[PDB]
């Protein structure tokens, strides 16, 4: 069987997980790992969406691109500050 | 279809293959083997470890022991 | 400059591509004290335990 | 409903059936061996279609109890990482049967039996989730490849190649086995999922990681022990030389990606600079060594070593770019090195030289082989639009996310890789002919011109559109890099 | 699925032809003992499975007894 | 010196009974823990000297004798670590060694029809009788401890028992002696597949009982790792039955 659609996943964070003793509960480890990776990919796609928005900005902006898209530039950069598995700046989620 | 394989080639080919019989730990070659066997690995190891240390210094995080 | 660059980089790398590695590395020191250079003591150690 | 077990059983059935029939009817033996290999290949492709890339948990699992307590058992299963290795090892075997198709009457039924046993065993290695039994199958390939190398090999030095190959996989293998036993006694089970979710002692991970690396630094051609590959690879048959550089070199990297990166995360961080230095010096030293070679086989055997060493730079750089590029370059090398060694094999099976200086200026005589060789050595260059570039550049990008020195030396590896690759190309296919020892010689017949067509199409498909391959692995790679990294 | 007879009979036939080949004989020299070997292999495999089940349950009983005896030191 | 069938009966039938006798004596009559020391050093010496001496022998029966001594050391590893797992590994090793010794002596008796004496007489045996050559190679690998065969499981679980008791030196010496032990086994392999002597010795065909026993043992050795549960369960029950 299949849902023949998008793979719906539980948005709710899994229960029974303690940051002080993660290794105590093994059965809850894998779904917490999956949830963390899914949230990281959500952030990655948000950054990609902002990149697409500035992509479409730069064409219409013309010579004076700084004037009317400066607000979106900061929005795109702050997303790129906490990106996934990247440079030395590791986000603390 | 097999090549003629003239005699003046296989001797040099085997000499390149059988070079293991010519090694007597000469001092100049001993220094040559030692430098590229130890020093360059040590120099590059210091390079990467100090690159990591300088990267971590700017972020302010304490340096990993890196044993 | 077509001669200085050649002799100083291309010639040097061509010489030292073999001179150091193929002589004092790969087959060599990793072989004389490795598989069968001198660690094959068992052949010299064969006729000492049947006493 | 095609499961994982049928794929494993197909080579077994092909081998058992092949032993029943006698050796007089040689046509039946070759036909049945090729048919079994091809149906296994089709089954592997079918398994690809029904592969869920969304979930992080493993695909089809078949559990067969091994110990009476169900403490450890055959736990088969594929993921984003193991699937493509299974596809590649199912794809290479029919090529292996097809290259020596003319000489089958000289080899016999032992040749196809050995190759199908290798296919079975190599499939069992990649798609299983029991750490101990994976070790059993991991060096179980000793016997069949020992037979293949020794029985049909060099003239008189075939004995020494078999011994060096067999000796390099003993001390490190059993030193790994000691760590296997310590892990089994400490935790209690060898199930991969259980072992991932275990608190290992901080001082303990160093010893276990060192023991694992010791047995993987021999399969992956690291700096201390990599001299076996050139000698034991020239002193090897062409079909035994196309899986030795096509699958066996993947065991070390895959073993790193399965039982080393997850289980020992902080040990991986603590040992990161050392691996970087080893890989960089391996790349540089192999690049400088391979440009003064006259053996027709080692010239690309060293290229294989350089590529495998470059793999570990991004494989050990914990990153989605690094690991993804690692497996992409691994598949790319599994194709390109196989193609290069098939070209060397067809060149050798006509003239029987095993040299480089004998051949020269044969483009006017074998134009088709000239074009095919140019395309293969062109892919070895890592052109964008070819297989190697996407993976290898992804490795460079991923490593430069972590470190800025060592992988610059990795990139400097290709400043000479491309140079000596084209120089090697120009030894043979360029210049005036020398009809003093090249009296008569032909071009590729129908078999070996069609054998490269899958290689060509796979290479271009890697080069122009690798999204489908990256699509199925981004879940597994991201899960791998984030394991034991709570924050 | 294999029912411990599709493997026992196959092993019996295999060992019959294996012993037949070691004497440098044609593989199907005596098919009557080939059928005998198939039957013997099937019977032996079934007996092995049944004995394994009995042996595992007896071992579980022995472990339970040993654990109960060892527990008595604390209490 | 002893006749081949006599040596076949020896090193299997006597050793099993004597090892059961030693188990009965060791478990009950030994509580001072002083037999750990005498078994430790003697088993280590047996391992080392068997591995280092069987490589220098040119006959067949001497090689089997020294292989038997080495396997006796491997089995005696289980006495030093006195636990349920140690005795289990010891008994499993005895069982596997008995099967492999029966198979090897069946091989030797098969070639005894033409008076095989040295190791070089079995040259190019893959041509005259390929299937017997394959059987002998498989049995020799099983002696060596190669993973995809029986004999590797016995050494594996013996090492597990040795590491369970913290006798870390026993594991290391076992590993190194195995490494040297496999070397001369593969040396036996080369002269029997790869290099072909000028003069070939022809062996007359075998009889049905030896062939049947050899086939049964060969299929047991190769396919043991597929279904090893019954042996492990027998051995666990036997180890616990010494007390209850
Ligand atoms: C040598 C090479 C082996 C290569 C084959 C490997 C392929 C693996 C399949 C091997 C195979 C046969 C072994 C053949 C050995 C060859 C003969 C050797 C000598 C040749 C002359 C055993 O495989 C199964 O056997 C089971 C036995 O219980 C075990 O399950 C564990 O057991 C518990 C323990 O107590 C554990 O507690 C528990 O965790 C598990 O449940 C496992 O071993 C395994 O699941 C196939 O399964 C066969 O056995 C049983 C299972 O059903 C079937 O018969 C049964 O009989 C009744 C019970 O009396 C049942 O009531 C009845 O329902 C059933 O019909 C068969 O039809 C067939 O399926
Ligand atoms: C990763 C790859 C990315 C794509 C790269 C494509 C670049 C082209 C690759 C092939 C270039 C041609 C090199 C072939 C070998 C050169 C020497 C040779 O053998 O030429 C052959 C064949 O010549 C050719 O070049 C034909 C090959 C095709 C060349 C055109 C390639 C066009 C397709 C590739 C690009 C397509 C667009 C991009 C696809 C997405 C025979 O030449 P003749 O003129 O017949 O000489 C006769 C010999 N004799 C005198 C001794 C009698
Ligand atoms: C383990 C899993 C993998 C293995 C699976 C095994 C499968 C089950 C076994 C299947 C066997 C099928 C064999 C086909 C039936 C053949 C029966 C022929 C019997 C026969 O002809 O009688 C004599 C042959 O000797 C004989 O045949 C009797 C001697 C046989 C020796 C058996 C010894 C059993 C006791 C020891 C068991 C092993 C213990 C190991 C610890 C006469 O022979 P002839 O008329 O041809 O001429 C005289 C030559 N002398």
Automatic annotation (TrEMBL), chain B:
Origin: domain of life: Eukaryota
UniProt GO BP: photorespiration
Transmembrane segments annotated in the record for this chain: 30-48
GO annotations of cellular component type: mitochondrial membrane; mitochondrion; respiratory chain complex I
Keyword hit for Transmembrane: yes
Keyword tags: Membrane, Receptor, Transmembrane, Transmembrane helix
Name this polypeptide is given: At2g31490
Organism whose genome encodes this protein: Arabidopsis thaliana
TrEMBL record, chain E:
A GO CC term assigned to this protein in UniProt: cytosol
Top-level lineage group: Eukaryota
UniProt-listed PANTHER family: EXCITATORY AMINO ACID TRANSPORTER
Name listed for the protein in its UniProt record: Excitatory amino acid transporter
Organism field: Arabidopsis thaliana (Mouse-ear cress)
């Amino acid at each position: 069987g299949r849902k023949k659609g998008l793979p719906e996943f539980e948005e709710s964070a899994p229960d029974g997980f303690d940051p002080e003793n993660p290794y105590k509960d093994p059965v809850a480890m894998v779904e917490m790992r999956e949830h963390i990776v899914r949230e990281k990919w959500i952030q990655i796609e948000k950054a990609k969406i902002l990149r697409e928005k500035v992509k479409w900005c730069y064409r219409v902006e013309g010579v004076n691109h700084y004037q009317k898209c400066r607000h979106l530039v900061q929005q795109y950069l702050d997303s790129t500050r906490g990106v996934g598995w990247g440079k030395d700046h590791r986000p603390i989620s | 279809m097999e090549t003629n394989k003239n005699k003046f080639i296989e001797d040099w080919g085997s000499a390149r293959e059988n070079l293991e019989h010519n090694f007597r730990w000469t001092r100049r070659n001993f220094a040559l083997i030692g430098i590229f066997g130890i020093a360059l690995p040590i120099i590059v190891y210091k390079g990467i470890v100090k690159d990591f240390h300088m990267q971590d210094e700017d972020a302010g995080r304490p340096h990993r022991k890196f044993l | 400059f077509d001669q200085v660059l050649n002799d100083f980089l291309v010639r040097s790398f061509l010489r030292f591509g073999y001179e150091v590695s193929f002589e004092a590395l790969d087959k060599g020191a990793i072989e004389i004290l490795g598989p069968y250079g001198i660690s094959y003591t068992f052949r010299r150690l064969a006729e000492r335990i049947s006493q | 409903y095609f499961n994982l077990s049928g794929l494993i059983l197909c080579p077994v059935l092909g081998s058992i059936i092949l032993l029943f029939i006698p050796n007089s009817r040689i046509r039946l033996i070759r036909l049945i061996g090729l048919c079994a290999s091809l149906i296994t290949f089709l089954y592997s492709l079918v398994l690809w279609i029904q592969f869920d890339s969304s979930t992080a948990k493993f695909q089809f699992v078949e559990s067969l109890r091994w110990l009476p307590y169900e403490n450890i058992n055959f736990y088969l299963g594929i993921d984003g990482i193991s699937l493509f290795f299974v596809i590649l090892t199912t794809f290479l075997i029919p090529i292996c049967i097809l290259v020596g198709w003319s000489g089958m009457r000289s080899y016999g039924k032992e040749y196809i039996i050995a190759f199908l046993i290798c296919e079975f065993l190599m499939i069992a290695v990649f798609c299983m989730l029991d750490l101990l039994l994976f070790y059993v199958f991991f060096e179980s390939v000793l016997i069949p490849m020992f037979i293949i190398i020794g029985v049909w090999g060099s003239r008189q030095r075939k004995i020494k190649a078999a011994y060096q190959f067999f000796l390099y996989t003993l001390l490190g293998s059993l030193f790994m086995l000691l760590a296997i036993l310590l892990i089994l006694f400490q935790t209690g089970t060898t199930d991969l999922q259980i072992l991932l979710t275990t608190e290992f002692s901080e001082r303990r991970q160093i010893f276990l990681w060192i023991a694992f690396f010791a047995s993987f630094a021999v399969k992956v051609p690291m700096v201390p022990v990599h001299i076996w590959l050139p000698e034991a690879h020239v002193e090897a048959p062409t079909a035994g030389s196309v899986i030795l550089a096509g699958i066996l070199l993947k065991f070390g990297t895959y073993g790193f990606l399965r039982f080393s990166i997850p289980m020992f995360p902080e040990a991986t961080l603590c040992f990161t600079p050392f691996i970087y230095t080893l890989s960089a010096i391996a790349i540089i030293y192999t690049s400088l060594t391979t440009l003064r070679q006259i053996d027709l086989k080692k010239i690309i055997a060293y290229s294989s070593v350089a590529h495998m060493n470059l793999v570990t730079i991004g494989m050990f750089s914990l990153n989605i770019q690094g690991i993804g590029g690692s497996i992409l370059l691994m598949l790319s090398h599994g194709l390109v090195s196989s193609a290069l060694f098939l070209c060397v094999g067809v060149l050798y099976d006509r003239h029987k030289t095993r040299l480089v200086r004998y051949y020269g200026g044969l483009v006017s005589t074998m134009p088709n082989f000239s074009t095919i060789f140019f395309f293969f050595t062109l892919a070895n260059m890592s052109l964008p639009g070819t297989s190697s570039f996407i993976g290898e550049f992804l490795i460079l990008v991923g490593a430069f996310q972590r470190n800025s020195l060592v992988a610059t030396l990795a990139a400097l590896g290709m400043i000479l890789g491309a140079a000596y690759s084209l120089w090697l190309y120009n030894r043979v296919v360029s210049g005036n002919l020398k009809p003093d020892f090249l009296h008569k010689f032909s071009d590729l017949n129908g078999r070996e011109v069609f054998i490269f067509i899958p290689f060509l199409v796979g290479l271009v498909w890697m080069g122009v559109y690798p999204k489908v391959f990256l699509d199925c692995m981004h879940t597994s790679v991201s899960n791998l890099v984030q394991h034991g990294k709570f924050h | 699925p294999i029912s411990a007879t599709m493997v026992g009979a196959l092993l019996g036939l295999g060992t019959q032809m294996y012993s037949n080949a070691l004497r440098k004989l044609p593989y199907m020299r005596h098919p009557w003992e080939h059928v005998v070997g198939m039957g013997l292999g099937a019977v032996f495999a079934n007996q092995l499975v049944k004995w394994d089940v009995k042996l595992k349950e007896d071992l579980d009983v022995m472990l339970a007894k040993a654990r109960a005896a060892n527990e008595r030191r604390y209490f | 010196g002893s006749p081949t069938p006599v040596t076949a009966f020896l090193s299997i039938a006597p050793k099993i009974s004597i090892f059961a006798n030693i188990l009965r004596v060791f478990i009950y009559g030994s509580y001072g823990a002083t037999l750990q020391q005498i078994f430790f050093f003697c088993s280590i010496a047996s391992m080392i000297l068997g591995a280092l001496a069987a490589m220098a022998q040119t006959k067949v029966k001497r090689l089997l004798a020294y292989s038997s001594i080495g396997h006796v050391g491997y089995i005696c590893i289980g006495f030093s670590c006195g636990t349920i797992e140690g005795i289990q590994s010891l008994l499993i090793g005895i069982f596997i060694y008995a099967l492999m010794t029966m198979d090897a002596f069946a091989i030797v008796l098969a070639l005894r029809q033409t008076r095989v004496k040295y190791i070089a007489d079995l040259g190019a045996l893959a041509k005259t009788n390929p299937i017997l050559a394959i059987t002998f190679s498989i049995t020799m690998f099983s002696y060596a401890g190669i993973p995809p065969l029986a004999g590797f499981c016995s050494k594996f679980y013996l090492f597990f028992a040795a590491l369970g008791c913290g006798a870390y030196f026993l594991a290391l010496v076992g590993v190194v002696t195995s490494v040297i032990g496999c070397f001369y086994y593969i040396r036996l392999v080369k002269r029997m597949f790869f290099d072909t002597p000028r003069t070939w010795i022809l062996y007359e065909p075998m009889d049905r009982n030896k062939s049947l026993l050899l086939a049964m043992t060969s299929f047991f050795i190769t396919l043991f790792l597929l279904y090893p549960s019954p042996l492990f369960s027998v051995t666990h029950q036997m180890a616990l039955s010494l007390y209850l």
